[PDB]
Amino acid sequence: MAKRIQFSTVGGPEVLEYVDFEPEAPGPQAVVVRNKAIGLNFIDTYYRSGLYPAPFLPSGLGAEGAGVVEAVGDEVTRFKVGDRVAYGTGPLGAYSEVHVLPEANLVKLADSVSFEQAAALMLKGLTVQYLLRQTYQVKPGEIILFHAAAGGVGSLACQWAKALGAKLIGTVSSPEKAAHAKALGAWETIDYSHEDVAKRVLELTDGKKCPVVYDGVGQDTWLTSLDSVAPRGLVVSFGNASGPVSGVNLGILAQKDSVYVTRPTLGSYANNAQNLQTMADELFDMLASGKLKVDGIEQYALKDAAKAQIELSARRTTGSTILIP
Amino acid sequence: MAKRIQFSTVGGPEVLEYVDFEPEAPGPQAVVVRNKAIGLNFIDTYYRSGLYPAPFLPSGLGAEGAGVVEAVGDEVTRFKVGDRVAYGTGPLGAYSEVHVLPEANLVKLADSVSFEQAAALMLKGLTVQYLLRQTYQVKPGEIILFHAAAGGVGSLACQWAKALGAKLIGTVSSPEKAAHAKALGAWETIDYSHEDVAKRVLELTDGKKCPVVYDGVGQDTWLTSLDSVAPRGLVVSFGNASGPVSGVNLGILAQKDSVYVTRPTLGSYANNAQNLQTMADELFDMLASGKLKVDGIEQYALKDAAKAQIELSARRTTGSTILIP
C-alpha cells in the first residue's frame, strides 16, 4: 500500500481524496518511481473537472514529477533501481508517492538538478521549449506576445525569450505581476486591468503587430490575440485557463488579415520517448547555463492538493509551486 | 451610358439584372478599363448572395477582368490610354463593359497573352500562386492534398504542382473529373463518390498523411481535411463552395495531433499594388514557359451571367469559363 490523491467523480477541488491504494506491478517496459516532488499544473484541474476524460474511476492525477527508480520492467534497460528520474508526460498518477509509467516518458536527472527543481521545471519547461523552438521558431529581435506572462508557463517564457534575444510582451493582471515578469526577462509588460492589450501592442510594434501570439488563457483572450497578431501571423492557443475557445468561424481568420491558428499539446511535440529526450536535454541545458532560474518554490503536502489546486486556479500567486509526497 | 450586370437585393441568380449605368469619372489615381473579357468566380456568387456585404445597392459585381485602358486619372503614370491590362482584385464592377478601379489593382499584359486568357487566369492563377508559394512553400517531392482538383482553381493547382515537382492528390466527384485533373498534372486522384478521401490519403502517404491540405470547398470537407493532414501540418481553408466552415472548437486542432489552420484571402496576399506585380509576374512567367495552359474557354455573354453563375455553382462543368461584354 501507498498514499495517493484520486477522484471518483469529476468536478471541483472537493472531488480529490487522499487515500491508500495498491501500486501496480511494473509492466515489461514500465518503471516504478518514488515521487520525491510532484508537479502542479492546470492540466491536473482539467482532468479533475472532466474537461478531459479519465479512462476510469477512481482516477489518479497528474503526469509531472520526479523521484528515484524503485522497480523496473524485465525489458527496461535504460533505467535501473536507484536512478534519479523526472517526467512531465505519461499516464495519470503523479499525485502519489509511487507512480508507474512507461520508460519512454522518463528522463534521467543530472546530479546538479534537484527533485524540487525538476517538479517545478519539467512540464512547463518542455512546454515553453516546444512553443518557442518548435511551434514557432522565435528569432532574436522578434517582438512576440505572451499572455499571463507571470504565471507558471509565462514566467519560464519570460526567461527563455530573453535568452533567445527576443522581445516578449507579457500580459499580467497587476503591477506586482508586471515587476515579476520584467525581472525574469520580459521586454515590455501590459497590465490588462487599465490598458488595452491590443492597442498597446500596436504602439509597441509601431503598427506592425506580433509575428506570433502565445495564448494559454483561452476564451477570454481569444479576440485580443486575433487583434494583436500581424497579418499572416500565428496565434498559438495552448491553454484554457479562462475556458476553452470555441464557436469560431474560420472566416474570422480571413477578417483578421489571413492569420494562422494552432492548438498544440505537449503530447504531440514530445510524441516519443525520444523527441522528448531531445527537448528535455535542451531544457536542462538552459538550466545548467543559468539561462533558466527556479528560485523560491512554494511547497504543498500531497494531502493538500485541493488547497494548492485552488490557488493555481485562482491565479493570484506567483512563483514555482510543487507537491511533496 | 454603358451596360452592366448588377443586383438591387442579395439572393440567388434571379437577382442579377443587365442594365444601363453611368460610368464614374476616373479618380486621380484610378483607371478606366474597356472589358474585353470578364472573369467568373465563386466570389461573385458570395457577393450576390450576401455572404459578403456590398457597400451599397444597386451593386455591380466581380473583380476579375481584362481590357484596354480608356481613361486615366491625372496622377496615374504607370498606365496610359490604349494599354492592354488585366486585374483580379479591386472594387466590385468587373461585370460590365466599363470598369473603373485604382491603378494599384491593374497590371500590364504582354502582347503574348490574350484578354480571354487573362480573364480565365488572373484571379484563380494569383490564388494558386499564393497558396502554393506563400501560404505554404510546397517543395518538390511533397505529397499535398487539394480538394476539387478539377475545378477552376484546382485545375490550375494541378498544373502548378506538377511544375513544382510536387505530388498533388486531387479530390473529384467523378471519373471524368479524375481524368481531367490527372491530364493536367495531378499525381494521384480520388473520387469521393465511392472511396474515402481520408483513408486513401493514408495509404498513398504510407501512413504519414499530408504536410498541407488545400481545401476550398469549406464545410462539407472540413472533417476530411483534418483527417488527411499530418501531425503539426497545415489545413488551408480558402473557399466556401459547400458553405463556410464554422462552429469549430480550437480543441479540435489538438485532437487532430496539433494541426495548424488558416483562412487566407487573395486580398491579404496581394495586399498592395506591388505585392501583386510580384505574384502576377510569376503567374505570367508560368504561362509563358508553357507550365500553365489555358486551352478551351467556354464563353458566356455578359447579359447571361446568371446562367453562367448557375453552372459554376452546380460544379458539373469543367475547363476555363469567362464572360464577354
Same-domain check for residues A160 and A25? no
| Residue A191 backbone class (left: φ over 0; alpha: ψ -120 to 50; beta: rest) | beta
Q: Smallest CA–CA separation between A38 and chain B, in Å? A: 25
Interface contact flag, A249 B251, Cβ < 8 Å: no
| B52 touching chain A per CB within 8 A | no
The total number of structural domains that make up chain A: 2
Least Cα separation, residue B46 to chain A (angstroms): 13
Task: Count other Cβ atoms within 10 Å, centred on residue A274.
Answer: 9
Residue A68 C-alpha, separation from nearest chain B C-alpha, in angstroms: 32
Domain boundary among A234, A254, A269: A269
Cβ of residue B226 closer than 8 Å to a chain A Cβ: no
Contact at 8 Å (CB) between B26 and B72?
A: yes
Q: Pick the residue of A263, A269, A272 with the most B CBs within 10 A to test the interface with B by mutation.
A: A263
Q: Which residue of A250, A260, A269 is the best one to mutate when testing the B interface, meaning the one whose CB has the most B CBs within 10 A?
A: A250
Is A137's Cβ below 8 Å from some Cβ in B? no
Beta bridge partners of B235: B213, B261
Is A249 touching B (CB cutoff 8 A)? yes
B247: which chain A residues are within 8 Å (Cβ-Cβ)? Answer: 246-249
C-alpha grid cell for residue B237?
A: 481553408
Q: Judging by beta carbons within 10 Å of its beta carbon (0-12, 13-18, 19+), is residue A206 exposed, middle or buried?
A: exposed
| Residue from the list B135, B251, B265 with its beta carbon closest to the beta carbon of A263 | B251
Q: Which residues of chain B have a CB within 8 Å of the CB of A130?
A: none
Q: The domain that contains B151 carries what CATH number?
A: 3.40.50.720
Across the interface, whether the CB atoms of A246 and B248 are under 8 A apart is answered yes
Burial (CB count <10 Å: 0-12, 13-18, 19+), residue A292: buried
Residues facing residue A232 across a β-bridge: none
Q: Is B82 on the interface with A (CB under 8 A)?
A: no
Q: Report which of A215, A246, A253, A250 is spatially closest to residue A232, judged by C-alpha positions.
A: A253
Can you give the C-alpha Rg of chain A in angstroms?
20
**Domain co-membership, B265 together with B278:** no
Element housing A148 (H / E): none
Helix (H, G, I), strand (E, B) or coil at A107: strand
Q: Rounded to an integer, what distance in angstroms lies between the CA atom of residue B145 and that of residue B148?
A: 10
Q: What is residue A68's three-state secondary structure?
A: strand
Contact A261 B245 (CB under 8 A): no
Q: Which domain does B228 fall in, by range?
A: 124-269
* Three state DSSP letters for chain B: CEEEEEECCCCCHHHCEEEEECCCCCCCCEEEEEEEEEECCHHHHHHHHCCCCCCCCCECCCCCEEEEEEEECCCCCCCCCCCEEEECCCCCCCCECEEEEEHHHCEECCCCCCHHHHHCCHHHHHHHHHHHHHHCCCCCCCEEEECCCCCHHHHHHHHHHHHHCCEEEEEECCHHHHHHHHHHCCCEEEECCCCCHHHHHHHHCCCCCEEEEEECCCHHHHHHHHHHEEEEEEEEECCCCCCCCCCECCHHHHHCCCCEEECCCHHHHCCCCCHHHHHHHHHHHHHHCCCCCCCCEEEEEHHHHHHHHHHHHHCCCCCEEEEEC
User: Which triple of cell numbers denotes residue B70?
Assistant: 480608356
Do B234 and A260 lie within an 8 Å CB cutoff? yes
Could you tell me the three cell numbers for B75?
496622377
| Per-residue cell: B244 | 463556410
Q: Where a domain ends, among B253, B269, B285?
A: B269
- Are residue A134 and residue A54 in the same domain, yes or no? no
* Same-domain pairing of A257 and A318: no
Residue contacts between A and B (CB atoms, under 8 Å) = 94
Q: Which of A258, A269, A275 to mutate to test the interface with B (most CBs of B within 10 A)?
A: A258
Would you call B162 an interface residue with chain A, using a CB distance cutoff of 8 Å? Answer: no
Grid coordinates representing A160 are: 527563455
Query: Is the CB of residue A277 less than 8 Å from the CB of residue A301?
Result: no
* Cβ proximity of A136 and A108 under 8 Å: no
Residues of A in contact with B248 (CB under 8 A): 246-250
How distant is the Cα of B275 from the closest Cα of chain A, in angstroms? 14
- For A267, nearest residue in chain B (alpha carbons): B257
List residues forming the annotated binding site of A.
42, 130, 152-153, 173, 177, 192, 216, 238, 240-241, 264, 266, 315
Residues of A within the annotated binding site for NADPH?
42, 130, 152-153, 173, 177, 192, 216, 238, 240-241, 264, 266, 315
Question: Distance from CA of residue A16 to its chain's centroid?
Answer: 21
- A136 Cβ partners below 8 Å, 6+ apart? A211, A212, A234, A236
Q: How close B257 comes to chain A (CA, Å)?
A: 6
Residues B235 and B131 in one domain: yes
The verdict on a CB contact (< 8 Å) between B248 and A244 is no
- Any idea which residue has 443587365 for its cell? B18
Q: Are residues B215 and B233 in the same domain?
A: yes
Resolution in A: 2.4
Q: How far, in Å, CA of B253 to CA of B231, rounded?
A: 10
Tell me the CATH number at A319: 3.90.180.10
Within its chain, how far is the Cα of A145 from the centroid?
17
Q: Which helix (H) or strand (E) holds A53?
A: none
| Shared-domain flag, residues B183 and B87 | no
Interface touch A263/B254, C-beta < 8 Å = yes
Q: Are residues B107 and B39 in the same domain?
A: yes
CB of B250 less than 8 A from some CB of A: yes
Q: Which residues contact A316 (CB under 8 A, 6 or more apart)?
A: none
Partnered with residue A210 across adjacent β-strands are A229
Answer yes or no: are the C-beta atoms of B169 and B189 closer than 8 Å: yes
Cβ atoms of B298 and B317 closer than 8 Å: yes
Q: How far apart are CA A127 and CA A148, in angstroms?
A: 14
Same domain, B257 and B152: yes
Measure B250 CA to nearest chain A CA, in Å. Answer: 6
Same domain flag for A174 and A228: yes
- Whether A57 and A156 share a structural domain: no
CA distance B168 to B180: 14
Closest residue in B to A131 (Cα–Cα): B258
B274 touches chain A (CB under 8 A): no
DSSP-derived secondary structure letter, A17: E
HSE-up of A116 (CA within 13 Å, CB side)? Answer: 12
| Rg (alpha carbons) of chain B, rounded to whole number | 20
Q: Which of B244, B250, B259 sits opposite A249 (nearest CB)?
A: B244
Q: Let me know whether B171 and B195 are in one domain.
A: yes
DSSP string, A169-210: EEEESSHHHHHHHHHHT-SEEEETTTS-HHHHHHHHTTT--E
